[PDB]
Amino acid sequence: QVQLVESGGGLVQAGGSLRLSCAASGFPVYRNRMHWYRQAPGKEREWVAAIESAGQETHYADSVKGRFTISRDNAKNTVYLQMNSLKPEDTAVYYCNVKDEGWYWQTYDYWGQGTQVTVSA
Amino acid sequence: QVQLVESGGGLVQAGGSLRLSCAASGRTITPISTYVMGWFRQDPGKEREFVASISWNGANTYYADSVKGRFTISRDNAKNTVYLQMNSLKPEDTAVYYCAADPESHVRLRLGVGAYWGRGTQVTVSS
Amino acid sequence: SWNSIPLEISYEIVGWIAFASWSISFYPQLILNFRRRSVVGLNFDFVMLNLTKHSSYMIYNVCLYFSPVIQKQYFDTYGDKEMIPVAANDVAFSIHAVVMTAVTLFQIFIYERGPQKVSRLAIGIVVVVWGFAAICFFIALPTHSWLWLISIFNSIQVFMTCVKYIPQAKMNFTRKSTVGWSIGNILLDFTGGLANYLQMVIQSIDQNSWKNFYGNMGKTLLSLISIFFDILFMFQHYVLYPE
């Protein structure tokens, strides 16, 4: 059915930058509202960023507003998370996300395997 | 809101046939004829024991195990009156008989949780 | 007014069995928002339309159950020897549903984490609904036609039940799949719908009258719209879009 493949993450030193990617399969990225989420060890999943369905309108968590940026390459069917000014706080498995929003009754969340981003001071 | 007056009898003998009555009065949003009525006996010391009850349609009559197949209950939807025809009495039936009525619940009435109750009229069955 | 004790107890049993089935569904989503401290996946438009559906049904149930002035207008209307068609469990349901909808609405505000505001077109519907109900209030007021006003609230609750089901069934038809299906939540909604109808059927067969189905037309349609859509959802899940 629909598949999500994140890549781009790894070990980086405090203050650095990363360009996280997400390869969509089964759906067009320009048709759906794409999300990015992160999960630190033990702590619960945290929504990080979002890009509108048929436009360039974006939304970010206050923890990353100003440092992180979400964009999508239509000609590649991929969503990006350009994450600048990284801090050891930002260490987490980053998941790109898409959903089947559902009016009443439970919305279905689609996840990738995640990419570990580790930031060291 | 609703007054219940038991126009019953007094002293009868073991194996006798007595007959209690109960007029219902008062101004209410419900017709009083649709009001579910019944009887309860007190007895020196012991708490309010159920005796009988009649549905507003007068079809369903409930009787306690102790009186079942001895007492009969009848209604008069026009005079708003219940009747307890206590036939083939026993010395253990001697108690104050209270009239009871509930505007809505038959179950509440049956469980001694009725809204309205009468003065009570002593029935003495002597051996 | 209750003639048969077994029918009355089976009415009371089926009553709280309908209440539990529809009230417990509110908790899984409430708890999920709490654990997350976010409402990202939530349809905000639906939570604001369900508040109107719940408060309108709550207005009708609380007023008919507790007001003797309104009850006397019900007898003046459907008949003197008529049983009031509002139950303790309907009052409990409406209040519990209003409380739970207000809590999820509070969760949307305090937890935020829902950039997807959604809020539009559905806001106009709340304005139109509450506006039309305000006009209705001023019409009802000089004559104190609280039964006609309460009756409008129950009719707008009916419209609002259609608003709950229709967009979600429409989504499944265009989508050509049943996404978010849960045989469990559908069965709880189904039980509450059958039990809310079995309650009226018991009140109707105890008395020799069907006027309670006309007096509380809003509860009758609340059960039938729930049952129809559960059959339709089960129909498009197994025999239409299964895979």
Author numbering:
A (entry chain C): 1 to 121
B (entry chain B): 1 to 127
C (entry chain A): 3 to 245
Which of the paper's sentences describe this entry?
Cystinosin is a proton coupled lysosomal cystine transporter, which functions as the primary route for the export of cystine out of the lysosome. The transporter comprises seven transmembrane helices (TMs) and uses the outwardly directed proton electrochemical gradient, generated by the V-ATPase, to drive cystine export from the lysosome in a 1:1 stoichiometry. To address these questions, we present the crystal structures of cystinosin from Arabidopsis thaliana in both apo and cystine bound states.
Using a similar strategy to our recent work on the KDEL receptor, we screened both a synthetic nanobody (sybody) library and a library generated via llama immunisation to identify specific binders to cystinosin. The transporter adopts a compact V-shaped structure, consisting of seven transmembrane (TM) alpha helices and adopts an inward (cytoplasmic) open state, with the CDR3 loop of the sybody (Syb39) extending into the cytoplasmic entrance of the binding site. On the luminal side of the transporter the llama derived nanobody (Nb4) interacts with the N-terminus of TM1 and the luminal end of TM7. Within the crystal the binders act to bridge two of the transporters together, aiding crystal packing within the lipidic cubic phase. In the structure of cystinosin, a polar cavity extends 23 Å into the centre of the transporter from the cytoplasmic side of the molecule, which contains a high density of positively charged side chains. The luminal side of the transporter is sealed through the packing of TMs 3, 6 and 7, which are stabilised through interactions between Asp92 (TM3), Gln201 (TM6) and Lys221 (TM7). Our structure highlighted an interaction between Asp92 on TM3 with Lys221 on TM7 and Gln201 on TM6, which forms the only inter bundle salt bridge between the two 3TM repeats. Another notable difference observed in cystinosin is the presence of a luminal helix connecting TM2 and TM3.
